[PDB]
């Protein structure tokens, strides 16, 4: 059981490295979709001032 728990814990550490490699993609992909709304928000700087 100690040989199995320690086998699972490096597998648990293997999925931790699997975890943040997806999360570091999600921060990037959120930005371009947010950047789609910056240029939408920057239009309202001129349209409302008209």
């Amino acid at each position: 059981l100690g040989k199995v728990s320690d086998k699972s814990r490096e597998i648990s550490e293997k999925y931790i490295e699997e975890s943040q490699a997806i999360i570091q993609e999600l921060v990037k992909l959120t930005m371009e979709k947010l950047e789609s709304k910056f240029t939408k928000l920057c239009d309202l700087e001129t349209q409302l001032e008209m």
Binding site: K3, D6, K7
Partner: peptide
Amino acid sequence: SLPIEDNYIREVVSKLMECVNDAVQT
């Protein structure tokens, strides 16, 4: 060509070691 009795016709008629060797190490 004589018929035969019906109760006579009814009368005539690696995967282990792949898991064990993995179970001894961990």
